[PDB]
Amino acid sequence: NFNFNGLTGTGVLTESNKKFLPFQQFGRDIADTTDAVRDPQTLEILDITPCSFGGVSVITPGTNTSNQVAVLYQDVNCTEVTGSNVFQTRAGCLIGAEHVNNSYECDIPIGAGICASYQTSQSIIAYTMSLGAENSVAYSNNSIAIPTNFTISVTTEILPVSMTKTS
Protein backbone atom coordinates (compact mmCIF):
# COMPACT_ATOMS: atom_id res chain seq x y z
CA ASN A 1 0.00 0.00 0.00
CA PHE A 2 2.02 2.96 -1.36
CA ASN A 3 2.05 6.70 -0.65
CA PHE A 4 4.48 8.85 -2.70
CA ASN A 5 4.28 12.56 -1.93
CA GLY A 6 0.58 12.15 -1.07
CA LEU A 7 -0.33 9.97 -4.11
CA THR A 8 -1.59 6.51 -3.26
CA GLY A 9 -2.47 3.05 -4.59
CA THR A 10 -1.80 -0.69 -4.14
CA GLY A 11 0.66 -2.60 -6.28
CA VAL A 12 4.09 -4.00 -7.01
CA LEU A 13 6.71 -1.36 -7.76
CA THR A 14 9.74 -2.26 -9.88
CA GLU A 15 12.28 -0.59 -12.13
CA SER A 16 10.74 1.11 -15.15
CA ASN A 17 12.06 1.48 -18.68
CA LYS A 18 10.44 4.92 -18.96
CA LYS A 19 12.35 8.18 -19.26
CA PHE A 20 11.31 11.57 -17.95
CA LEU A 21 12.33 15.21 -17.77
CA PRO A 22 14.17 16.28 -14.45
CA PHE A 23 11.00 18.31 -13.99
CA GLN A 24 8.49 15.47 -13.80
CA GLN A 25 7.63 13.31 -10.79
CA PHE A 26 4.75 10.91 -11.66
CA GLY A 27 3.46 8.96 -14.66
CA ARG A 28 -0.20 8.73 -15.53
CA ASP A 29 -2.65 6.27 -17.06
CA ILE A 30 -6.25 6.74 -18.09
CA ALA A 31 -8.27 9.04 -15.82
CA ASP A 32 -4.99 10.11 -14.17
CA THR A 33 -4.32 6.84 -12.36
CA THR A 34 -0.66 6.88 -11.31
CA ASP A 35 1.32 4.23 -13.25
CA ALA A 36 4.81 5.28 -12.27
CA VAL A 37 6.55 7.28 -9.65
CA ARG A 38 10.04 8.46 -9.29
CA ASP A 39 11.33 7.91 -5.84
CA PRO A 40 11.57 11.23 -3.85
CA GLN A 41 15.11 10.31 -2.66
CA THR A 42 16.43 7.74 -5.14
CA LEU A 43 16.67 8.91 -8.72
CA GLU A 44 15.05 5.84 -10.30
CA ILE A 45 11.80 5.51 -12.22
CA LEU A 46 9.55 2.87 -10.81
CA ASP A 47 6.69 1.14 -12.71
CA ILE A 48 3.51 0.43 -10.79
CA THR A 49 2.06 -2.92 -11.58
CA PRO A 50 -1.47 -3.14 -10.09
CA CYS A 51 -1.57 -5.85 -7.34
CA SER A 52 -3.00 -9.05 -8.97
CA PHE A 53 -6.76 -9.73 -9.11
CA GLY A 54 -9.06 -12.12 -11.00
CA GLY A 55 -11.88 -14.57 -10.28
CA VAL A 56 -11.72 -18.10 -8.89
CA SER A 57 -12.80 -20.82 -11.27
CA VAL A 58 -13.41 -24.22 -9.85
CA ILE A 59 -12.98 -27.37 -12.01
CA THR A 60 -15.61 -29.76 -10.91
CA PRO A 61 -16.01 -33.44 -12.00
CA GLY A 62 -19.45 -34.68 -12.33
CA THR A 63 -20.35 -35.21 -8.64
CA ASN A 64 -21.95 -38.41 -9.80
CA THR A 65 -18.38 -39.65 -10.49
CA SER A 66 -15.92 -38.11 -7.98
CA ASN A 67 -15.04 -35.34 -5.49
CA GLN A 68 -11.80 -34.36 -7.26
CA VAL A 69 -11.70 -30.58 -7.66
CA ALA A 70 -8.96 -28.23 -8.99
CA VAL A 71 -8.90 -24.45 -8.78
CA LEU A 72 -7.92 -21.92 -11.43
CA TYR A 73 -6.98 -18.44 -10.25
CA GLN A 74 -7.39 -15.93 -13.06
CA ASP A 75 -4.76 -13.34 -14.09
CA VAL A 76 -2.20 -14.44 -11.52
CA ASN A 77 1.21 -16.23 -11.43
CA CYS A 78 1.95 -19.33 -9.24
CA THR A 79 4.36 -17.18 -7.26
CA GLU A 80 1.55 -15.08 -5.80
CA VAL A 81 -1.34 -17.61 -5.13
CA THR A 82 -0.11 -22.35 -3.79
CA GLY A 83 0.04 -26.22 -3.12
CA SER A 84 1.99 -29.24 -4.41
CA ASN A 85 0.17 -29.75 -7.74
CA VAL A 86 0.92 -26.33 -9.09
CA PHE A 87 1.04 -25.55 -12.77
CA GLN A 88 0.96 -22.28 -14.64
CA THR A 89 -1.56 -21.89 -17.47
CA ARG A 90 -2.06 -18.99 -19.83
CA ALA A 91 -5.52 -18.31 -18.31
CA GLY A 92 -4.24 -18.29 -14.69
CA CYS A 93 -2.59 -20.36 -11.86
CA LEU A 94 -3.96 -23.90 -11.74
CA ILE A 95 -3.71 -25.81 -8.49
CA GLY A 96 -4.68 -29.46 -7.84
CA ALA A 97 -4.62 -30.52 -11.50
CA GLU A 98 -1.81 -32.17 -13.46
CA HIS A 99 -0.66 -31.31 -16.98
CA VAL A 100 -0.42 -33.50 -20.08
CA ASN A 101 1.66 -32.64 -23.26
CA ASN A 102 -0.84 -34.42 -25.65
CA SER A 103 -3.83 -32.77 -27.22
CA TYR A 104 -7.44 -33.99 -26.79
CA GLU A 105 -11.04 -32.85 -27.15
CA CYS A 106 -12.43 -30.15 -24.72
CA ASP A 107 -14.79 -30.89 -21.84
CA ILE A 108 -13.92 -28.27 -19.17
CA PRO A 109 -12.38 -24.98 -20.68
CA ILE A 110 -9.52 -23.06 -18.98
CA GLY A 111 -8.70 -20.54 -21.71
CA ALA A 112 -6.01 -19.68 -24.25
CA GLY A 113 -6.05 -23.16 -25.86
CA ILE A 114 -5.98 -24.98 -22.51
CA CYS A 115 -8.97 -27.24 -21.51
CA ALA A 116 -9.45 -29.80 -18.72
CA SER A 117 -11.03 -33.23 -18.43
CA TYR A 118 -10.98 -36.44 -16.39
CA GLN A 119 -8.91 -39.51 -17.28
CA THR A 120 -7.47 -42.72 -15.65
CA SER A 121 -6.65 -44.21 -11.07
CA GLN A 122 -8.59 -41.02 -12.23
CA SER A 123 -7.27 -37.49 -11.93
CA ILE A 124 -7.87 -33.90 -13.07
CA ILE A 125 -5.89 -33.15 -16.16
CA ALA A 126 -5.26 -30.00 -18.21
CA TYR A 127 -4.81 -30.71 -21.93
CA THR A 128 -3.89 -28.91 -25.12
CA MET A 129 -6.97 -28.57 -27.31
CA SER A 130 -6.73 -30.77 -30.44
CA LEU A 131 -9.68 -29.15 -32.24
CA GLY A 132 -10.66 -32.61 -33.53
CA ALA A 133 -8.98 -35.55 -35.27
CA GLU A 134 -6.88 -34.95 -38.35
CA ASN A 135 -8.09 -36.37 -41.66
CA SER A 136 -5.07 -37.30 -43.82
CA VAL A 137 -6.78 -37.10 -47.17
CA ALA A 138 -4.60 -38.16 -50.11
CA TYR A 139 -4.80 -35.96 -53.16
CA SER A 140 -4.17 -36.06 -56.88
CA ASN A 141 -5.53 -34.19 -59.97
CA ASN A 142 -6.58 -37.46 -61.89
CA SER A 143 -8.57 -39.45 -59.25
CA ILE A 144 -11.90 -38.86 -57.50
CA ALA A 145 -13.71 -40.19 -54.43
CA ILE A 146 -17.35 -41.09 -55.14
CA PRO A 147 -19.34 -42.92 -52.47
CA THR A 148 -21.28 -46.16 -52.66
CA ASN A 149 -24.46 -46.37 -50.42
CA PHE A 150 -25.71 -43.83 -47.76
CA THR A 151 -27.34 -43.69 -44.36
CA ILE A 152 -29.77 -41.47 -42.46
CA SER A 153 -28.76 -39.32 -39.59
CA VAL A 154 -31.24 -37.14 -37.80
CA THR A 155 -30.24 -33.94 -36.02
CA THR A 156 -32.27 -32.77 -33.08
CA GLU A 157 -32.39 -29.02 -32.93
CA ILE A 158 -33.86 -26.98 -30.15
CA LEU A 159 -34.76 -23.33 -30.54
CA PRO A 160 -36.31 -20.72 -28.15
CA VAL A 161 -39.64 -19.32 -29.29
CA SER A 162 -41.21 -17.48 -26.38
CA MET A 163 -40.90 -16.13 -22.84
CA THR A 164 -43.17 -15.89 -19.82
CA LYS A 165 -45.71 -13.06 -20.19
CA THR A 166 -44.74 -11.07 -17.16
CA SER A 167 -45.84 -7.61 -16.06
Binding site: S143, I144, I146, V161, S162
Partner: protein, 209 residues
Protein backbone atom coordinates in the same frame (compact mmCIF):
# COMPACT_ATOMS: atom_id res chain seq x y z
CA UNK B 1 -36.12 -44.08 -32.29
CA UNK B 2 -32.49 -43.40 -31.31
CA UNK B 3 -33.29 -39.73 -30.81
CA UNK B 4 -36.09 -40.57 -28.46
CA UNK B 5 -33.77 -42.85 -26.43
CA UNK B 6 -31.16 -40.09 -26.33
CA UNK B 7 -33.57 -37.41 -25.15
CA UNK B 8 -34.92 -39.73 -22.47
CA UNK B 9 -31.53 -40.66 -20.96
CA UNK B 10 -29.82 -37.30 -21.58
CA UNK B 11 -32.30 -34.47 -20.62
CA UNK B 12 -29.48 -31.91 -21.02
CA UNK B 13 -29.89 -32.50 -24.76
CA UNK B 14 -32.78 -30.02 -24.60
CA UNK B 15 -30.75 -27.42 -22.64
CA UNK B 16 -31.14 -24.73 -25.29
CA UNK B 17 -34.80 -24.42 -24.28
CA UNK B 18 -34.31 -25.15 -20.56
CA UNK B 19 -32.06 -22.09 -20.48
CA UNK B 20 -34.93 -19.86 -21.71
CA UNK B 21 -37.25 -20.81 -18.94
CA UNK B 22 -34.39 -20.59 -16.42
CA UNK B 23 -33.44 -17.06 -17.53
CA UNK B 24 -36.95 -15.74 -17.13
CA UNK B 25 -37.34 -17.41 -13.74
CA UNK B 26 -34.07 -15.82 -12.64
CA UNK B 27 -35.09 -12.38 -13.86
CA UNK B 28 -38.22 -12.57 -11.70
CA UNK B 29 -36.37 -14.02 -8.73
CA UNK B 30 -33.91 -11.15 -9.05
CA UNK B 31 -36.65 -8.54 -8.70
CA UNK B 32 -38.21 -10.24 -5.74
CA UNK B 33 -34.95 -10.51 -3.84
CA UNK B 34 -33.89 -6.90 -4.68
CA UNK B 35 -37.24 -5.72 -3.42
CA UNK B 36 -36.19 -6.58 0.18
CA UNK B 37 -33.07 -4.39 -0.12
CA UNK B 38 -32.95 -1.08 1.65
CA UNK B 39 -30.60 0.38 -0.98
CA UNK B 40 -28.74 2.03 1.96
CA UNK B 41 -32.04 3.36 3.51
CA UNK B 42 -32.99 3.08 7.18
CA UNK B 43 -35.55 0.32 6.55
CA UNK B 44 -36.84 -1.64 3.53
CA UNK B 45 -40.18 -2.27 5.17
CA UNK B 46 -42.77 0.40 4.46
CA UNK B 47 -44.94 -0.05 7.52
CA UNK B 48 -41.77 0.00 9.60
CA UNK B 49 -40.27 3.13 8.10
CA UNK B 50 -43.58 4.96 8.59
CA UNK B 51 -43.98 3.93 12.26
CA UNK B 52 -40.22 4.29 12.99
CA UNK B 53 -39.53 7.78 11.68
CA UNK B 54 -41.39 11.05 11.89
CA UNK B 55 -43.41 11.24 8.58
CA UNK B 56 -41.26 13.90 6.74
CA UNK B 57 -38.14 11.76 7.22
CA UNK B 58 -40.00 8.57 6.43
CA UNK B 59 -40.89 10.20 3.09
CA UNK B 60 -37.18 10.72 2.33
CA UNK B 61 -36.39 7.13 3.17
CA UNK B 62 -39.36 6.11 0.99
CA UNK B 63 -37.96 8.08 -1.96
CA UNK B 64 -34.70 6.20 -1.50
CA UNK B 65 -36.59 2.89 -1.62
CA UNK B 66 -38.65 4.04 -4.59
CA UNK B 67 -35.60 4.94 -6.60
CA UNK B 68 -33.91 1.65 -5.75
CA UNK B 69 -37.00 -0.38 -6.65
CA UNK B 70 -37.55 1.58 -9.87
CA UNK B 71 -33.90 0.90 -10.79
CA UNK B 72 -34.50 -2.83 -10.17
CA UNK B 73 -37.59 -2.69 -12.39
CA UNK B 74 -35.84 -0.75 -15.16
CA UNK B 75 -32.99 -3.27 -15.05
CA UNK B 76 -35.53 -6.09 -15.33
CA UNK B 77 -37.35 -4.45 -18.21
CA UNK B 78 -34.11 -3.72 -20.05
CA UNK B 79 -33.03 -7.34 -19.65
CA UNK B 80 -36.42 -8.57 -20.85
CA UNK B 81 -36.29 -6.22 -23.89
CA UNK B 82 -32.79 -7.36 -24.83
CA UNK B 83 -33.81 -10.97 -24.32
CA UNK B 84 -36.99 -10.30 -26.29
CA UNK B 85 -34.78 -9.30 -29.22
CA UNK B 86 -32.75 -12.53 -28.79
CA UNK B 87 -35.86 -14.71 -28.46
CA UNK B 88 -37.49 -13.07 -31.45
CA UNK B 89 -34.34 -13.73 -33.49
CA UNK B 90 -34.50 -17.40 -32.43
CA UNK B 91 -38.22 -17.53 -33.22
CA UNK B 92 -37.51 -16.05 -36.66
CA UNK B 93 -34.84 -18.66 -37.29
CA UNK B 94 -37.12 -21.42 -36.08
CA UNK B 95 -39.90 -20.17 -38.33
CA UNK B 96 -37.42 -20.08 -41.18
CA UNK B 97 -36.31 -23.66 -40.55
CA UNK B 98 -39.84 -24.88 -40.52
CA UNK B 99 -40.60 -23.30 -43.83
CA UNK B 100 -37.20 -24.26 -45.36
CA UNK B 101 -36.93 -27.95 -44.17
CA UNK B 102 -40.53 -28.96 -43.25
CA UNK B 103 -42.84 -27.21 -45.72
CA UNK B 104 -40.35 -27.23 -48.59
CA UNK B 105 -36.86 -28.48 -49.39
CA UNK B 106 -34.10 -25.93 -48.93
CA UNK B 107 -30.73 -25.93 -50.65
CA UNK B 108 -29.05 -23.90 -47.88
CA UNK B 109 -25.75 -25.39 -46.82
CA UNK B 110 -25.83 -27.40 -43.58
CA UNK B 111 -28.80 -25.26 -42.71
CA UNK B 112 -30.87 -27.88 -40.78
CA UNK B 113 -27.81 -30.10 -40.14
CA UNK B 114 -24.94 -31.84 -41.94
CA UNK B 115 -25.89 -34.07 -44.90
CA UNK B 116 -28.21 -33.78 -47.88
CA UNK B 117 -31.58 -32.54 -46.70
CA UNK B 118 -34.35 -35.12 -47.05
CA UNK B 119 -37.20 -34.21 -44.68
CA UNK B 120 -38.02 -32.57 -41.33
CA UNK B 121 -40.55 -32.81 -38.55
CA UNK B 122 -41.50 -30.11 -35.91
CA UNK B 123 -42.43 -30.81 -32.31
CA UNK B 124 -44.08 -28.50 -29.81
CA UNK B 125 -42.10 -27.67 -26.70
CA UNK B 126 -42.56 -25.57 -23.52
CA UNK B 127 -41.96 -22.07 -24.89
CA UNK B 128 -39.99 -23.35 -27.86
CA UNK B 129 -39.77 -25.60 -30.87
CA UNK B 130 -37.89 -28.76 -31.51
CA UNK B 131 -37.21 -30.19 -34.91
CA UNK B 132 -35.95 -33.50 -36.14
CA UNK B 133 -34.00 -32.75 -39.27
CA UNK B 134 -33.44 -35.77 -41.46
CA UNK B 135 -30.47 -35.83 -43.79
CA UNK B 136 -28.33 -38.20 -45.88
CA UNK B 137 -24.69 -38.98 -45.32
CA UNK B 138 -22.54 -41.21 -47.71
CA UNK B 139 -21.62 -44.68 -46.36
CA UNK B 140 -18.21 -45.31 -48.04
CA UNK B 141 -15.92 -42.97 -50.03
CA UNK B 142 -14.39 -45.25 -52.73
CA UNK B 143 -11.42 -44.19 -55.05
CA UNK B 144 -12.13 -44.11 -58.90
CA UNK B 145 -10.16 -42.78 -61.92
CA UNK B 146 -11.54 -39.52 -63.33
CA UNK B 147 -11.47 -37.07 -66.18
CA UNK B 148 -13.20 -33.73 -67.07
CA UNK B 149 -14.02 -35.16 -70.46
CA UNK B 150 -13.22 -38.03 -72.72
CA UNK B 151 -12.76 -37.55 -76.53
CA UNK B 152 -13.77 -39.39 -79.65
CA UNK B 153 -13.46 -38.35 -83.33
CA UNK B 154 -11.02 -35.73 -82.00
CA UNK B 155 -13.78 -33.84 -80.09
CA UNK B 156 -14.39 -33.35 -76.37
CA UNK B 157 -17.38 -35.10 -74.71
CA UNK B 158 -18.63 -33.76 -71.39
CA UNK B 159 -21.31 -35.29 -69.14
CA UNK B 160 -24.82 -33.87 -69.26
CA UNK B 161 -25.29 -35.61 -65.94
CA UNK B 162 -22.91 -36.16 -63.03
CA UNK B 163 -19.21 -37.07 -63.53
CA UNK B 164 -16.96 -39.17 -65.83
CA UNK B 165 -15.20 -42.06 -64.04
CA UNK B 166 -13.20 -45.18 -64.86
CA UNK B 167 -12.53 -48.74 -63.49
CA UNK B 168 -9.27 -49.05 -65.63
CA UNK B 169 -10.93 -50.65 -68.69
CA UNK B 170 -14.00 -48.53 -69.53
CA UNK B 171 -15.33 -45.03 -68.98
CA UNK B 172 -18.63 -44.51 -67.28
CA UNK B 173 -20.71 -41.62 -66.04
CA UNK B 174 -22.01 -41.59 -62.46
CA UNK B 175 -24.03 -39.14 -60.50
CA UNK B 176 -22.27 -36.26 -58.78
CA UNK B 177 -23.24 -37.75 -55.44
CA UNK B 178 -23.17 -41.56 -55.97
CA UNK B 179 -21.19 -44.21 -57.81
CA UNK B 180 -23.84 -45.65 -60.09
CA UNK B 181 -22.11 -45.73 -63.53
CA UNK B 182 -23.69 -45.72 -67.00
CA UNK B 183 -21.45 -46.63 -69.94
CA UNK B 184 -20.59 -43.35 -71.62
CA UNK B 185 -22.95 -43.01 -74.58
CA UNK B 186 -23.44 -40.30 -77.19
CA UNK B 187 -26.98 -39.76 -75.97
CA UNK B 188 -25.90 -38.49 -72.56
CA UNK B 189 -22.95 -36.25 -73.47
CA UNK B 190 -22.33 -32.71 -74.64
CA UNK B 191 -19.86 -32.15 -77.40
CA UNK B 192 -17.98 -28.95 -77.90
CA UNK B 193 -14.42 -28.00 -78.75
CA UNK B 194 -11.39 -30.09 -79.75
CA UNK B 195 -10.09 -32.99 -77.53
CA UNK B 196 -6.97 -30.83 -76.80
CA UNK B 197 -9.03 -28.09 -75.12
CA UNK B 198 -9.54 -30.04 -71.95
CA UNK B 199 -6.64 -30.50 -69.59
CA UNK B 200 -6.68 -34.09 -68.39
CA UNK B 201 -8.94 -35.32 -71.21
CA UNK B 202 -8.88 -39.02 -71.94
CA UNK B 203 -9.11 -40.67 -75.45
CA UNK B 204 -11.90 -43.37 -75.16
CA UNK B 205 -15.06 -44.98 -76.54
CA UNK B 206 -18.40 -43.26 -76.54
CA UNK B 207 -21.07 -45.86 -77.20
CA UNK B 208 -24.06 -45.86 -79.56
CA UNK B 209 -27.05 -47.52 -77.55
Amino acid sequence: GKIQDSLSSTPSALGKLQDVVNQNAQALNTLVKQLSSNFGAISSVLNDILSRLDPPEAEVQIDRLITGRLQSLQTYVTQQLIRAAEIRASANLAATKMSECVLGQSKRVDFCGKGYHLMSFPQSAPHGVVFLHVTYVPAQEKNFTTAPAICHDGKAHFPREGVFVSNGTHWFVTQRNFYEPQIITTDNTFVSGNCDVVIGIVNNTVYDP
